[PDB]
Design an enzyme around this catalytic site. Structure first.
Site, PDB file in Angstrom:
ATOM      1  NE  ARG C  60      64.224  56.207  52.142  1.00 30.04           N
ATOM      2  CZ  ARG C  60      65.168  56.390  51.224  1.00 30.04           C
ATOM      3  NH1 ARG C  60      65.393  55.457  50.310  1.00 30.04           N
ATOM      4  NH2 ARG C  60      65.872  57.511  51.207  1.00 30.04           N
ATOM      5  CG  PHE C  65      68.847  60.840  46.070  1.00 29.02           C
ATOM      6  CD1 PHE C  65      70.180  60.802  45.701  1.00 29.02           C
ATOM      7  CD2 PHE C  65      68.466  60.202  47.238  1.00 29.02           C
ATOM      8  CE1 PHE C  65      71.098  60.069  46.431  1.00 29.02           C
ATOM      9  CE2 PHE C  65      69.377  59.485  47.991  1.00 29.02           C
ATOM     10  CZ  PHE C  65      70.695  59.410  47.582  1.00 29.02           C
ATOM     11  CD  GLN C  68      65.032  51.950  49.980  1.00 29.61           C
ATOM     12  OE1 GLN C  68      65.291  53.056  50.442  1.00 29.61           O
ATOM     13  NE2 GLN C  68      65.378  50.821  50.588  1.00 29.61           N
ATOM     14  CG  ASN C 107      73.721  46.705  49.950  1.00 27.84           C
ATOM     15  OD1 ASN C 107      73.723  47.933  49.839  1.00 27.84           O
ATOM     16  ND2 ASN C 107      74.718  45.950  49.505  1.00 27.84           N
ATOM     17  CG  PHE C 118      68.276  52.125  44.837  1.00 27.58           C
ATOM     18  CD1 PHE C 118      69.072  52.856  43.968  1.00 27.58           C
ATOM     19  CD2 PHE C 118      68.878  51.224  45.694  1.00 27.58           C
ATOM     20  CE1 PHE C 118      70.433  52.668  43.942  1.00 27.58           C
ATOM     21  CE2 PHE C 118      70.238  51.027  45.675  1.00 27.58           C
ATOM     22  CZ  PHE C 118      71.020  51.752  44.805  1.00 27.58           C
ATOM     23  CG  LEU C 127      74.687  55.079  45.014  1.00 29.10           C
ATOM     24  CD1 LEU C 127      74.524  56.325  44.159  1.00 29.10           C
ATOM     25  CD2 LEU C 127      73.365  54.420  45.269  1.00 29.10           C
ATOM     26  CG  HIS C 131      73.759  50.276  46.721  1.00 31.21           C
ATOM     27  ND1 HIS C 131      72.797  49.704  47.526  1.00 31.21           N
ATOM     28  CD2 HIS C 131      74.049  51.476  47.273  1.00 31.21           C
ATOM     29  CE1 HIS C 131      72.512  50.529  48.518  1.00 31.21           C
ATOM     30  NE2 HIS C 131      73.260  51.609  48.390  1.00 31.21           N
TER      31      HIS C 131
END
Ligand SMILES: CCCCCCCCCCCCCCCC(=O)OC[C@H](COP(=O)(O)OC[C@@H](O)CO)OC(=O)CCCCCCCCCCCCCCC
Lengths: 145, 497, 173, 145, 486
Positions: C60, C65, C68, C107, C118, C127, C131
């Site tokens: 990803r 941003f 991943q 997760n 990531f 976040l 995470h």
């Protein structure tokens, strides 16, 4: 509870839920720019679906395709139709929009275990779900029927 | 400037295409029409060569590209290297002499000479293309016409050999297709197909080795490498002479062309990985095919396995990572194109006279046909790597490429030279066994009642006209090396660093 | 950057080949604070087990941003079993997502850390709490930007397969 | 490096600390793979004489539409001269070393200019460089004899 | 309410009304003008579908029918199959003394059912239109009416086709239950995860029974035993029309009901299509070697070429689209109707379908031998003909998607197809004055009706088997723009 279908995503920007009359946890992250979503048409959203605590059980990014939904005709949860279109005068979404929603179990599938394939269930009772809808686009040729 | 190689390649197909119905129901009109077209195409090749092919510049000459399909990025990339124009001249020359030898065919000579011209176009399309996928287009466009020739013209069990050939070449050209799919898709960013753009890539070894195997199993059936050579004693040995002299002259040497074109400048490092094994396989190939040749009671199959034996020197010169190795490989390509073409021609004419296939029968015939005997004897000497002939200097420059190798050490080189030099002992055994069987001797029943016709002037021009460039290269070998040594330097620049 | 304990390298290959090696990703580990996630990440650096991050992709990419990767068993974000059996919990979120180049382990929600991380690009400190946040790039930030600048598809996958060619331990610790 | 068939890079032999290169690069007549034999210092001294006489008696080769064979013959024989001067200066007597390597440098720059003249198909520069390269080839032969 | 998007089928129902008005007035005094109004109904439907080219992919009816560009292309292929196959039974009816009326009705309504199956979006029409087409198929197969073997074979086909559709619709029932009460393909994947039945055994049984029913429709090697038995006695024009139209409409549905309501179970979906594809590619091309019939081994070659199409089904829109599958269906129609045109002409001049009667066609008729040999070499793909570039585009997209074990098996079975194709081309080229058959020696091209339209459509199929491999770039350029299949 179990069978969560582990799909580790990156999470979504948390925010406070400006509540509705019908108890909907409601937080519009990104205001879309375009037309409003029509009632009864096929719409394509992305979402990550979460429980009360935030653990994931479903995603449109799991399927790598925007989920086509005919919203407003009750083919989905009333939480979807009241947080995308808006029931009590809540503003409807515009295209390319993002929105978090805390679905209350009144709007969600009650205390009823939504989905039970073999003993274990997909959703436990009163899950008070957390949806993170990325309303990306209208289905190209779509009707209100 | 001018669409040179396009009007080279499309002219035999588009000019043989005027035999639509053409109501002349003998072989005279289409016979002379097709030898006219082949002469015009040969003069087109020479006119593109003598006047617009610079023999110094080791780059893509007569360059041309069209658009064919945007999705494949598939062009009509045409262009000649130094390693290519020897094979193009060999193609035009040997196939023009093939349709010269193909005069007395009269069964369905319209469709025959049309597929002769179809092969005569598709082969030059294979050698002239600077594209992988167009090389594959022409690699399978040379398949169905020579199938239709092989099956409907020439040979006892020609149906079996024709189907075995077409299935074997198709079931290896699918691996060629795997190779071109791999290089084009997973070659690099921006998937392309122009070989001008493609010979300068990284290609790590776990990908380059898979590419190299995908092309080596493809080219290993066409230059017959001894795990994969079962198609050839049937295909060559059960064809008649005019189709087999281009099956052995130029169709056998593509692939070996591709081992220089695709498997040597596109994939250098995995070629350096597997040329240690290809060297040993070529040395086993020479001895193996030279020893299968006295085991053949058939005449024409001995020349087929003789061709398998002489392809071992090409495989060795390709695997010899040297200018003398690769240059002797190109020389053996052209030399044995002449040699195999002339020997299968004379074997077809000897079968047409004597009507005896094997060599337990067909005893002393040299008093009966002395012209066929003297040409077959001199061309056997050309096959012997015996001097004044091009096969001599071809194999000796292959030996010199072995002995001057930077890849290999003395432990390997002694064994390689020893095994290869046994091959030039085994080659006199089967060649002179063929000569003492079908020509030497005397049969008491054959005195005056038969009185066989000798070689006519047409077939004798075929044999002499193939013999003369063999002699002209065997006394002055720069008729081959000088048109390719610059390009072989450009090849080995990628190997020596 | 509170006590980079283990500097560790893994190198990528963008585009169509498998060994193109367009730069590398040399990062650090804050193993003193998180033992579990750093231990899993060290075992996924070819570790001593046969499974690791060799051959895994960055499945990803999201612009502006994080990107991943880490999933080795599958290639969509599902096959993520750990060295602590299959799936383990989260530990002691001391430092935060301070900006570019973090190795925060992905997760689904709480107590479900797997094999997937990531690499953060823009300053997204929100976040935390979900995470576990550890790791920091030191070499190859333009390589991460080269991953992120690729044009993606409908399913937010890179059109060029950004695959991790090798993963091993530096001799820094 | 498994004895037979050393594999991979396929190197050329290096230069043993000599200033025999161009210094803006190594040299432009380096043929890639040739077999110079490890005979001995008198053997290299004689083969310098032999190939210097070869490039001396390159007279009947030079002419119009022949410059490519001039370039190939120059690259070949000068690659032989290059490895042989490398072994001779590499086994020199520490006082013959410097004048002979200066001789080799002023010979090899002359070879570079003649190779560029024959590379651009220019016959006038080819002959105008071949005059004093004939001088220097006679000089190096009467040194080695 | 106005569904103007279904105007090319409105032209079909208009032609059906004109067919019945001619079929009520005189009943005897109109053979050729009835064929004229039917063929021009096809041409008017085609030009209406081209006039509605650039329209939006609008679901026209009340959540029932979607006129996608993808569906427009497959309707165009069914219309092209019907146009290029409709002259192939203007001599068969007058040769076998059947009724040209109601035969034209059957072909028009089979075309109608196929074009509705292409645009079908409710699960209702994905049963109505395929079995509209299949009842028309049973009426077309039971049409010779001179023997026992044709009628027994079409009765067994009616049993297997009812079993086919009933397994397919039992899977549709598991869709309709597991996905709440939802139909409409776009809404069914919504209905699975509204009811949290995505990870369910019910939707797994849904997918398995749907793909078994589609494999019955596609005649893939588990569910493939019908085509050789049912293409012996059934007449060669309806063998052509029904095989080609059935498999193009079944690949239409096999994309349609497999990408939109099954992108969640795509792993087991690709695995089931990969199993059926590899077995189909192997077994069609490996039975078609060893048969002395001509239409049976053509049915197996059609099975193998549909197994090639399934490689384009398995690849998505992205890493090599369905456009390769589209252009290979265009090539497949073009080079298969020519083969069946030649097989029809061997039977409008001889009467037999035995493959050993072909020895000596080159000496008697070089035109028909050239057309059949060139169509078979297009089906095999040795020179740059259409089918070689179609298989190349398929294997390209499969290799770019990484489906290595699909492409390699497709290549080996392409070589295996090359064998039985050149096994045929041995016969219609050679001839040795007793290998010729007495069913061949009396060929009699001159006792013929006129300059027929069988020869015209046959040479159109020969040119469409030769030049669109050369001219493929406009076809790929018009096929890559079908991105709305989702
Ligand atoms: C530079 C090298 C280039 C040339 C290499 C020479 C090749 C070998 C010559 C081998 C010819 C032997 C083949 C041979 O023995 O043929 C024998 C053949 C038969 O001639 P006779 O006069 O024996 O034929 C009449 C008989 O029927 C009665 O004996 O004579 C030739 O045609 C003469 C040609 C020899 C020309 C030399």
């Amino acid at each position: 509870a179990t069978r969560i279908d582990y799909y580790a995503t990156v999470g979504d920007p948390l925010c406070e839920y400006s509540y509705a009359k019908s108890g909907l946890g409601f937080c519009d992250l990104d205001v879309g720019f375009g037309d409003e979503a029509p009632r009864g048409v096929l719409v394509n959203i992305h979402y990550t679906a979460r429980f009360a605590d935030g653990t994931l059980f479903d995603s449109s990014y799991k399927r790598a395709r925007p989920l086509t939904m005919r919203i407003g005709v009750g083919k989905v949860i009333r939480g979807l139709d009241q947080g995308i279109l808006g029931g009590e005068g809540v503003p409807p979404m515009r295209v390319g929009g993002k929105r978090k929603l805390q679905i209350p179990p009144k709007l969600a599938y009650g205390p009823e275990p939504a989905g039970c394939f073999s003993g274990d269930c997909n959703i436990p009772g009163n899950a008070t779900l957390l949806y993170d809808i990325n309303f990306v686009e209208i289905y190209p040729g779509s009707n209100t029927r | 400037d001018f669409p040179w190689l396009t009007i080279i390649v499309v002219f035999p197909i588009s000019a043989g295409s005027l035999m639509l119905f053409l109501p002349h129901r003998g072989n005279k009109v289409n016979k002379w029409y097709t030898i006219c077209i082949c002469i015009l195409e040969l003069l087109l090749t020479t006119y593109a060569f003598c006047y617009n092919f610079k023999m110094d510049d080791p780059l893509i000459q007569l360059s041309e590209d069209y658009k064919w399909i945007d999705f494949f990025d598939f062009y009509w990339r045409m262009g000649i290297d130094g390693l290519s124009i020897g094979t193009i001249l060999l193609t035009g020359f040997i196939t023009t002499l093939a349709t010269l030898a193909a005069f007395p065919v009269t069964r369905d000579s319209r469709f025959f000479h049309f597929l002769m011209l179809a092969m005569y176009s598709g082969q030059i399309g294979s050698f002239s293309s600077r594209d992988l996928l167009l090389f594959f287009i022409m690699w399978e466009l040379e398949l169905i016409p020579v199938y239709l020739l092989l099956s409907m013209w020439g040979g006892k069990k020609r149906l079996y050999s024709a189907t075995k050939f077409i299935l074997y070449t198709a079931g290896s050209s699918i691996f060629l297709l795997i190779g071109v799919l791999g290089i084009s898709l997973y070659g690099s960013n921006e998937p392309t197909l122009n070989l001008e753009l493609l010979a300068n890539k990284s290609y790590p070894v776990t990908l380059e080795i898979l590419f190299y195997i995908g092309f080596l199993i493809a080219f290993a059936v066409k230059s017959p490498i001894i795990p994969l050579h079962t198609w050839l004693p049937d295909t060559h040995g059960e064809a008649h002479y005019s189709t087999c002299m281009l099956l052995a002259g130029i169709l056998l040497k593509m692939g070996a062309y591709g081992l220089v074109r695709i498997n040597m400048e596109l994939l250098p490092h995995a070629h350096s990985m597997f040329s240690p094994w290809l060297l040993v396989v070529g040395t086993i190939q020479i001895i193996y095919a030279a020893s299968t040749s006295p085991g053949q009671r058939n005449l024409k199959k001995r020349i087929a396995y003789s061709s398998v034996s002489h392809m071992g020197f090409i495989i060795i010169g390709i695997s010899s990572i040297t200018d003398p190795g690769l240059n002797g490989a190109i020389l053996q390509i052209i030399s044995h194109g002449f040699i195999g073409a002339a020997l299968f021609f004379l074997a077809g004419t000897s079968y047409d006279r004597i009507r005896l296939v094997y060599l337990d029968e067909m005893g002393g015939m040299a008093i009966s046909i002395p012209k066929i005997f003297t040409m077959f004897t001199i061309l056997s000497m050309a096959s012997l790597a015996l001097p004044g002939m091009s096969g001599f200097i071809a194999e000796f420059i292959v030996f010199f490429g072995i002995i001057t190798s930077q890849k290999y050490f003395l432990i390997s080189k002694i064994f390689i030279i020893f095994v290869m030099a046994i091959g030039m002992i085994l080659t006199p055994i089967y060649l002179l066994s063929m000569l003492r069987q079908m020509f030497y001797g005397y049969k008491l029943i054959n005195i005056k009642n038969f009185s066989f016709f000798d070689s006519g002037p047409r077939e004798l021009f075929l044999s002499i006209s193939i013999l003369l460039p063999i002699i002209g290269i065997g006394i002055y070998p720069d008729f081959v090396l000088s048109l390719a040594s610059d390009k072989v330097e450009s090849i080995l620049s990628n190997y020596f660093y | 950057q509170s006590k980079i304990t283990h500097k560790v390298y893994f190198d990528i290959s963008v585009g169509n080949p498998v060994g193109k090696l367009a730069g590398r990703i040399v990062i650090g580990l804050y193993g003193d604070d998180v033992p579990q996630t750093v231990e899993n990440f060290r075992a996924l650096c070819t570790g001593e087990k046969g499974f690791g991050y060799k051959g895994s992709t960055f499945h990803r990419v999201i612009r502006d941003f994080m990107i991943q990767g880490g999933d080795f068993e599958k290639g969509n974000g599902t096959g993520g079993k750990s060295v602590y059996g299959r799936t383990f919990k989260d530990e002691n979120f001391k430092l935060s997502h301070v900006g570019p180049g973090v190795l925060s382990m992905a997760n689904a929600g709480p107590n479900t850390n797997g094999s997937q991380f990531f690499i953060c690009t823009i300053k997204t400190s929100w976040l935390d709490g979900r995470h576990v946040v550890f790791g920091q790039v030191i070499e190859g930030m333009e390589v991460v930007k080269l991953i992120e600048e690729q044009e993606t598809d409908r399913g937010d996958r890179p059109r060029k397969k950004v695959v991790i060619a090798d993963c091993g331990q530096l001799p820094m610790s | 490096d498994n004895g037979f068939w050393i594999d991979g890079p396929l190197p050329i032999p290096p230069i043993y600390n000599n200033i025999v290169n161009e210094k803006t690069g190594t040299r432009t007549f380096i043929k890639k793979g040739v077999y110079v034999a490890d005979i001995g210092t008198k053997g290299r001294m004689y083969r310098v004489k032999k190939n210097a006489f070869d490039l001396l008696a390159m007279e009947d080769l030079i002419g119009p539409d022949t410059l490519n064979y001039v370039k190939k013959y120059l690259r070949l024989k000068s690659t032989f001269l290059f490895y042989d001067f490398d072994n001779l200066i590499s086994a020199a007597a520490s006082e013959d070393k410097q004048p002979l390597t200066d001789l080799a440098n002023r010979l090899f720059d002359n070879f570079e200019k003649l190779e560029d003249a024959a590379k651009t198909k220019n016959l006038a520069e080819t002959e105008s460089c071949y005059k004093d390269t004939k001088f220097l080839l006679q000089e190096v032969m009467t040194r080695m004899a | 309410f106005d569904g103007s998007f279904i105007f090319p089928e409105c032209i079909l129902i208009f032609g059906l009304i004109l067919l019945l008005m001619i079929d009520s007035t005189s009943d005897q005094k109109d053979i050729p003008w009835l064929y004229f109004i039917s063929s021009t109904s096809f041409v008017m439907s085609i030009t209406a579908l081209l006039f509605r080219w650039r329209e939006e992919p609008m679901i026209s009816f009340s959540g029932n029918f979607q006129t996608n560009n993808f569906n427009e292309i497959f309707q165009f292929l069914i219309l092209l199959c019907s146009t290029l196959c409709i002259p192939l039974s203007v001599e068969y009816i007058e040769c076998t003394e059947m009724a040209i009326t109601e035969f034209l009705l059957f072909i028009l309504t089979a075309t109608l059912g196929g074009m509705f199956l292409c645009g079908a979006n409710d699960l209702i029409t994905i049963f109505v239109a395929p079995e509209c087409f299949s009842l028309c198929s049973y009426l077309l197969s039971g049409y010779t009416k001179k023997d026992i073997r044709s009628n027994e074979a079409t009765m067994k086909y009616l049993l297997m086709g009812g079993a086919s559709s009933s397994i397919l619709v039992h899977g549709f029932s598991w869709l309709y239950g597991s996905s709440g009460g939802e139909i409409e393909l776009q809404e069914i994947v919504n209905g699975l995860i509204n009811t949290q039945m995505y990870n369910s055994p019910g939707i797994s049984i849904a997918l398995i029974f749907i793909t078994v029913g589609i494999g019955f429709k596609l005649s893939l090697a588990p569910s493939h035993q019908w085509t050789p038995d049912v293409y012996e006695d059934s007449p060669t024009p309806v063998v052509a029309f029904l095989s080609v139209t059935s498999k193009v409409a079944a690949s239409a549905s096999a994309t349609r009901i497999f990408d939109i309501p099954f992108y969640f179970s795509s792993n087991e979906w690709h695995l089931l299509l990969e199993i059926l594809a590899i077995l189909s590619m192997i077994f069609g091309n490996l039975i078609a070697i060893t048969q002395t019939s001509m239409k049976r081994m053509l049915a197996y070659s059609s099975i193998g070429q549909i197994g090639y199409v399934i490689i384009g089904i398995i690849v998505g829109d992205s890493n090599g689209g369905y456009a390769s599958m589209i252009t290979y269906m265009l090539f497949y129609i073009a080079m298969n109707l020519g083969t069946f045109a030649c097989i029809i002409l061997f039977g409008l001049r001889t009467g037999t379908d035995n493959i050993r009667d072909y020895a000596g066609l080159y000496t008697k008729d070089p035109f028909l031998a050239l057309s059949l040999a060139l169509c078979l070499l297009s089906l095999g793909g040795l020179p740059p003909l259409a089918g070689f570039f179609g298989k190349l585009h398929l294997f390209w997209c499969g290799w770019q998607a990484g489906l290595y074990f699909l492409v390699s098996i497709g290549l080996l079975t392409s070589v295996l197809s090359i064998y039985y194709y050149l096994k045929i081309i041995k016969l219609l080229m050679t001839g040795r004055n007793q290998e010729i058959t007495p069913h061949m020696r009396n060929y009699r091209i001159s006792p013929l009706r006129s300059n027929n339209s069988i020869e015209l459509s046959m040479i159109v199929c020969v040119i469409a088997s030769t030049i669109p491999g050369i001219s493929m770039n406009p076809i790929i350029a018009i096929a890559q723009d079908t991105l709305f299949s989702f």
